[PDB]
């Protein structure tokens, strides 16, 4: 046992030394030689109403028009952002929903929470009403996040410190991801869907392989649990958000932090993080009731999206990048442009 | 300017809004309470008796008493980082806490069961998300306590205890120790009750506590109290 522990410590030291040896230059030094972006002004265009409870999760559609939001009242609402009209209202069998997902094709949606079960609903039934298609049971903890890989399979995250890939038609998880010391909080899919990353309460982010089912890479440096994670538009990097009031940008190739986004006066945690279409701007939600836009290449603050009366829990940018939607615990969802 | 199909979509959205409003109005009239405690503390017995009077995850129990609807949530089976989902219960009307009175001389793999129960009660009561949430405490194993106290002294659990070994004094000491864990007595109050094989009084006590909490909340809303 002692020999194995010493070997593990030596391997960790070697990995740290290898990572340090290649830190020849920093992103900030190189990016100092470009003109910064000016003050970003965003005015709310639509204020979606109809939810009578806290908003916890939301996902933008591929068409960049339809979006789905989850609330604690047990109702899933599909909103037409262009006209604000409600498309569907799905009553959840369990009101304790903590996450929701929208399929790339828009045929099915997913949700889950403290019930430890992920439910799939069909939006294109010949019956004309939205009904649950399959239920993905087997997790020993509350569902944290879920994302649709394709019409056939879905990847979900749970609080039992493990993530699994579920085959909708089969109903049985085909791959199980293990290695996280803390509860897994968020998931993000790469643009090519080849790889995905997950954040856990152990303040570390891990890189997983869809088919191999093994952790290729690990990330560390956060001083608190990670709650948000999102891939860079290029797909070679991602950013994470924790409760220590700092956002860290991690790139898959360097296996080290590139730049840190934080402000002295902010002492609250970070709920959600998202990237612009081109990746030039970084948007993160904070518990102080407003969203802050961060200069990705310079870490300078670009603007503030204020107006929410409660904690900002979720946000997302459209596929085309035309507008960004933000959710909050006051039951109101706003779209900014 | 809107087309016929757009007008139909608007009408459908308005109908959905009306349905959501009706559902919210229906749901706002049900009292939501949270139940906490250890598996052997008597949670199962309490749930069974209340259900009679009227797999992994959380158990939902519905019961009605005096034309008032109650919703009970059990999170005992959900062993995980509770502070990551405890905030989901901010709107809980009241919290039900169950502790076994006879577990003072038993051991758990804190070392003592009662010390762990007191620590859990202290953590839940002082939680930042339960500033104005009242707490109800139920003692489920007083009948076994009657026999156990007459043989095993209470000094094992509380070395500082120096009062008489009589049943009433021990029960009063336990109640006072449990109550003293409150730091915000002005903002919130604790309701204590003793449970046994008899179950008629438990529901009445719960209803009275819920009514008092609702009355106090409405007084706060009106500005009084």
């Amino acid at each position: 046992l002692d020999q194995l522990r010493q070997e593990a410590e030596q391997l960790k030291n070697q990995i740290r030394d290898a990572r340090k040896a290649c830190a020849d230059a920093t992103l900030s030094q190189i990016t100092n030689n470009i003109d910064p972006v000016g003050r970003i002004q965003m005015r709310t265009r639509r204020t979606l109403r109809g939810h009578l409870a806290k908003i916890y999760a939301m996902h933008w559609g591929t068409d960049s028009r339809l979006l789905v939001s989850a609330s604690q009242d047990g109702k899933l609402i599909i909103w037409d952002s262009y006209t604000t009209n409600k498309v569907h209202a799905i009553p959840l069998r369990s009101s304790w929903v903590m996450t929701c997902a929208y399929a790339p094709s828009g045929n099915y949606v997913a949700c889950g929470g403290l019930d430890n079960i992920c439910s799939i609903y069909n939006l294109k039934t010949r019956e004309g009403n939205v009904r649950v298609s399959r239920e993905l049971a087997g997790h020993t903890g509350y569902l944290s996040c879920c994302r649709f890989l394709d019409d056939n399979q879905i990847v979900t995250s749970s609080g039992d410190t493990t993530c699994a890939l579920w085959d909708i038609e089969t109903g049985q998880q085909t791959t199980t991801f293990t290695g996280h010391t803390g509860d897994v909080m968020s998931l993000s899919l790469a643009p090519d869907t080849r790889l995905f990353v997950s954040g856990a309460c152990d303040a570390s982010a891990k890189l997983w392989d869809v088919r191999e089912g093994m952790c290729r890479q690990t990330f560390t440096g956060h001083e608190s649990d990670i709650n948000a994670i999102c891939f860079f538009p290029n797909g070679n990097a991602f950013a994470t958000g924790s409760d220590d009031a700092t956002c860290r940008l991690f790139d898959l190739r360097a296996d080290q932090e590139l730049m840190t986004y934080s402000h002295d006066n902010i002492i609250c945690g970070i709920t959600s993080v998202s990237f612009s279409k081109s990746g030039r701007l970084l948007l993160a939600g904070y518990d102080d009731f407003n969203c802050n836009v961060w200069d990705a290449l310079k870490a300078d603050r670009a603007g503030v999206l204020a107006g929410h009366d409660n904690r900002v829990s979720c946000l997302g940018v459209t596929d085309d990048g035309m507008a960004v939607a933000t959710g909050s615990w006051d039951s109101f969802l706003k779209i900014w442009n | 300017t809107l087309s016929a199909e757009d007008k139909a979509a608007v009408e459908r959205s308005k109908m959905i809004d009306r349905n959501l409003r009706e559902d919210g109005e229906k749901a706002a009239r049900e009292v939501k309470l949270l139940l906490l405690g250890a598996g052997e503390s008597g949670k199962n017995t309490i749930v069974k008796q209340m259900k009679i009077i009227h797999t992994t995850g959380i158990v939902e129990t519905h019961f009605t008493f005096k034309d008032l609807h109650f919703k009970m949530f059990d999170v005992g089976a959900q062993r995980s980082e509770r502070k990551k989902w405890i905030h989901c219960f901010e709107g809980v009307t009241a919290i039900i806490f169950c502790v076994a009175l006879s577990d003072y001389d038993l051991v758990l793999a804190e070392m003592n069961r009662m010390h762990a129960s007191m620590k859990l009660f202290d953590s839940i009561c002082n939680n930042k998300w339960f500033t104005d949430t009242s707490i109800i405490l139920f003692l489920n194993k007083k009948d076994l306590f009657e026999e156990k106290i007459k043989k095993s002294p209470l000094t094992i659990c509380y070395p500082e205890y120096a009062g008489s070994n009589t049943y009433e004094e021990a029960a009063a000491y336990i109640q006072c120790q449990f109550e003293d864990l409150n730091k915000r007595k002005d903002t919130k109050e604790i309701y204590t009750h003793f449970t046994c094989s008899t179950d008629t009084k438990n529901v009445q006590f719960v209803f009275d506590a819920v009514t008092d909490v609702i009355i106090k909340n409405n007084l706060k809303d009106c500005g009084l109290f």
Partner: single-chain antibody, 231 residues
Framework: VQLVESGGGLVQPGGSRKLSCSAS????????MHWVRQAPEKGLEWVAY????????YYADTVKGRFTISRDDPKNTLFLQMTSLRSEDTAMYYC??????????????WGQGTTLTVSSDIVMTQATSSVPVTPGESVSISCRSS???????????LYWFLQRPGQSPQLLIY???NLASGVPDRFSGSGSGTAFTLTISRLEAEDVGVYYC?????????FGAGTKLEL
């Protein structure tokens, strides 16, 4: 999903009849209903429409006031109180489903219908009435409207319906080239503003029928003359 209309037969001009349609296999409450007439050897013509919840009702100019329509969600039955009758009222009545939301496909399902015998608006026209052609060869059908169907929202309200012999009309394309569910990829629609055309990659024995072009930009709904394919 099935619709069974009831009522019909010989009715005197001075009499009255009440038609009933039974809806099953779908959420009738959330689906709007339409009535379409089809006189012998004639084209289709919209009659009335009811939105979900009976909040909106429309009638054609030739039937306004005369005809009363009612809805009964609990029983999933649709009624048509047909108070007065003239000679021209003789025609087959078809019940059509309709649901209106983003991405929806209204007029997707058409009921079997019933036969009843009795003892400004946008003009839709189709130049071609009969287009004989052998199987396999591509066939094109063109329809035109007197007013542009392109709304400011960026979509054109045009529909294509195919009625095979002894069968009710079946939706093919809606607003205005999207393929209806359950239809082969052979059919394709195109157009611009006012000129539209329906093209088939290869004709099969199952494609024999009459094609109707319908507009939904504004009420009352108008149906084209109809083009028949034969071999």
């Amino acid at each position: 999903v099935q619709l069974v209309e009831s009522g019909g037969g010989l009715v005197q001009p001075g009499g009255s009849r009440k038609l009933s349609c039974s809806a099953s296999g779908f959420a009738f409450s959330s689906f709007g209903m339409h009535w379409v007439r089809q006189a012998p050897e004639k084209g289709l013509e919209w009659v009335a429409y009811i939105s979900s919840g009976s909040g909106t009702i429309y009638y054609a100019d030739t039937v306004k006031g005369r005809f009363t329509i009612s809805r009964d969600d609990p029983k999933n039955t649709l009624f048509l109180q047909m108070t007065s009758l003239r000679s021209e009222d003789t025609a087959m009545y078809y019940c059509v489903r309709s649901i209106y939301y983003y991405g929806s496909s209204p007029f997707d399902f058409w009921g079997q219908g019933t036969t009843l015998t009795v003892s400004s608006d946008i003009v839709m026209t189709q130049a071609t009435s009969s287009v004989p052609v052998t199987p396999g060869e591509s066939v094109s059908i063109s329809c035109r409207s007197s007013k542009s169907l392109l709304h400011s929202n960026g979509n054109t309200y045009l529909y294509w319906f195919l009625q095979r012999p002894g069968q009710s009309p079946q939706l093919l394309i809606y607003r205005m080239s999207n393929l209806a569910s359950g239809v082969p990829d052979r059919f394709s629609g195109s157009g611009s503003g006012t000129a539209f055309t329906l093209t088939i990659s290869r004709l099969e024995a199952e494609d024999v029928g009459v094609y109707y072009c319908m507009q939904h930009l504004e009420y009352p709904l108008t149906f084209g003359a109809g083009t028949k394919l034969e071999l």
